[PDB]
Amino acid sequence: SSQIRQNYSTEVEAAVNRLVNLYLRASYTYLSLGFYFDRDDVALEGVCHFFRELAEEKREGAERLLKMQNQRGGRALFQDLQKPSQDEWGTTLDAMKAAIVLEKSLNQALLDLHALGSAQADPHLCDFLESHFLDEEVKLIKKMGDHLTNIQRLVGSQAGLGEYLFERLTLKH
Amino acid sequence: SSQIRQNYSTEVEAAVNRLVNLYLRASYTYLSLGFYFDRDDVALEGVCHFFRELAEEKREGAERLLKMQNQRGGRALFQDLQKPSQDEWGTTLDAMKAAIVLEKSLNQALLDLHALGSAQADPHLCDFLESHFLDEEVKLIKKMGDHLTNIQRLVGSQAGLGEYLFERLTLKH
Amino acid sequence: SSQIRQNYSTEVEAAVNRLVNLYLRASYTYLSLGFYFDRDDVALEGVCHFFRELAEEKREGAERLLKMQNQRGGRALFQDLQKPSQDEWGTTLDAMKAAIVLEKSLNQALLDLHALGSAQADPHLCDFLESHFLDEEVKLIKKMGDHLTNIQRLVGSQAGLGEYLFERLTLKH
Amino acid sequence: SSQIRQNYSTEVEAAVNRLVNLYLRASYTYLSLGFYFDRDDVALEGVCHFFRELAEEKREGAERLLKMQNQRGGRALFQDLQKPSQDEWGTTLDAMKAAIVLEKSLNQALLDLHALGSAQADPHLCDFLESHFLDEEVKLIKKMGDHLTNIQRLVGSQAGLGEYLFERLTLKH
Ligand SMILES: [Cl-]
Ligand SMILES: [Cl-]
Ligand SMILES: [Cl-]
Ligand SMILES: [Cl-]
């Protein structure tokens, strides 16, 4: 058992474990999104790359939470990981809408844990989220919003042409 | 009071202060244009960058006028700065039309001050405008005209697609 | 309209627009202070430089707020900018007193927005101010206080001599 | 005789010769000022250097006028050079006042030649003065005005101390 734990509530400890699960679920969703866009009948390499990168980012977020759990003397507990919500993800527009919904759900979980930390007077937890998660999440959601607007502008007419152009001229590939 | 002032009319001194106001107003207009194109629901980064760069250029023009005012022994006087004429700027085409109108108004103010300087036999003022402002303004207006033509060619059909292509393939981003 | 806005109150959105106005007003005040010290009948280059640098810093603060407004899905709205409170700024001592008063007013606006963000449970806003504004402001006010003390020590007797020495041996020039 | 002269009036030709005389007279005045401040009983090295540099600058201005006279097919004619107006130049304040008076007289001669060139429709002459003389003269007069203000601030009380400090901390030495 821990000899280090101080000012670290059981409520926070549990919520951190739940948030690890949510990040790993998000990572898995992005893995599925990435490989869908690598299908020969979809074949949008830049979109594939975008989602593969996000799978890595979310895995890293979970690892940072687990590191923090140990630094505070909490105990990591892992649960089953639910499969992603879809097996096929539609168009780039459909996929980017699904990604924004996912990110808003993660952001809300961050905000809820921040509020719990505030209520429990756990400034280390609050700072940790502020420093490593909240701004990263706002920046990502802004980037996704920008992408959504551009995809919408392009597929309004000539959907196929528009989807190709976005992948070629906006996304990294 | 000044021990240096020579051949520097009160009329020119006042007109220079007015021109500083007009440049700072233009800078502010460009700031608003730049941030409008950074909105998540507009999201045209190259257009944002173009107008942000012009905000800087116009601020620098005002600073050069203020430096000159002091070099001649005139006295800088600042007035309120009017907010820009719009809060939302429409499409890239709408924005570039508004920018050309603005630039023509600045160019006319330059020409009017040049004529005043000529009438007052103030060759330093005339040279100063020739050397630092008049050609810069002609070059800018030509660039904006070129852009306008290209945007017009593109949005004639497929307005969304055209606006994206211009931002991606003409503007710096 | 925004597809990204989350946990971002209308009250905060408005207060951020007001704070942009206050920063741009401060920038304008510093521009006037800088050019006053460049007058041939004032001629304190280090003092000019000090205030010109602050005009840039305050403009950059406003730009960071506007960037943040867009990242959160708020809408930038610009108002008229009031001219500075004086047309002539007196001695270096008078100017540095006026600057401290200005900075304390900006600091109070930061603190008030922080308190609003706390009350609205907007940790991203609170963190943003903590990370980019509050410490910068404390450091600046301390520097100005240090300067004020040194100027006071010097102009107690031999005001002209003291003002020259401060400009030459403390300020950057 | 010239095979090249075109659009170059006898009036301009003569006035250019007179202006060469005035520049060489100014150069000679600065030579005397420079060596006065090198006296063992004056001994202000930075002031000496300042005026020696101006003697060179004025000689170079005369050489540029003579080059231009030949480029236009006019004929250089030299007259006697009057000695400087004083044999001893007083304090740094006295000397810098005398220098500003001299420079204003040169500036007025430039402006008068510009007006003659305008009246004679000689744009090459007008451009030549604009490009090589008028702005240089405005910048110099501003620098001298700045110096005068600083010297005045310093010698108001403790004249000896003030004169030393100006030489040590403003002038190049
Ligand atoms: Cl199980
Ligand atoms: Cl007013
Ligand atoms: Cl209004
Ligand atoms: Cl003779």
Swiss-Prot record, chains A, B, C, D:
Domain Ferritin-like diiron: 6-155
Keywords on record: Acetylation, Cytoplasm, Cytoplasmic vesicle, Iron, Iron storage, Lysosome, Metal-binding
Region feature Catalytic site for iron oxidation, mapped onto this chain: 53-60
Binding site for Fe cation: E53, E56, E57, E60, E63
GO cellular component: autolysosome; autophagosome; cytoplasm; cytoplasmic vesicle; ferritin complex
Lineage: superkingdom: Eukaryota
Primary location: cytoplasm
Membrane spanning residue stretches: none
Location in the cell: Cytoplasmic vesicle, Autophagosome; Cytoplasm; Autolysosome
One GO term of the biological process aspect: iron ion transport
N-acetylserine: modified positions: S1
Disulfide bond annotation, renumbered to this chain: none
RNA-binding keyword on record: no
KW Membrane (keyword) present: no
Molecular function GO terms recorded: ferric iron binding; ferrous iron binding; iron ion binding
Its biological purpose: Stores iron in a soluble, non-toxic, readily available form. Important for iron homeostasis. Iron is taken up in the ferrous form and deposited as ferric hydroxides after oxidation. Also plays a role in delivery of iron to cells. Mediates iron uptake in capsule cells of the developing kidney. Delivery to lysosomes by the cargo receptor NCOA4 for autophagic degradation and release or iron.
Subunit structure: Oligomer of 24 subunits. There are two types of subunits: L (light) chain and H (heavy) chain. The major chain can be light or heavy, depending on the species and tissue type. The functional molecule forms a roughly spherical shell with a diameter of 12 nm and contains a central cavity into which the insoluble mineral iron core is deposited. Interacts with NCOA4.
Other comments on record: In horse spleen the light chain is the major chain.
Family membership noted in the UniProt record: Belongs to the ferritin family.
Protein name: Ferritin light chain
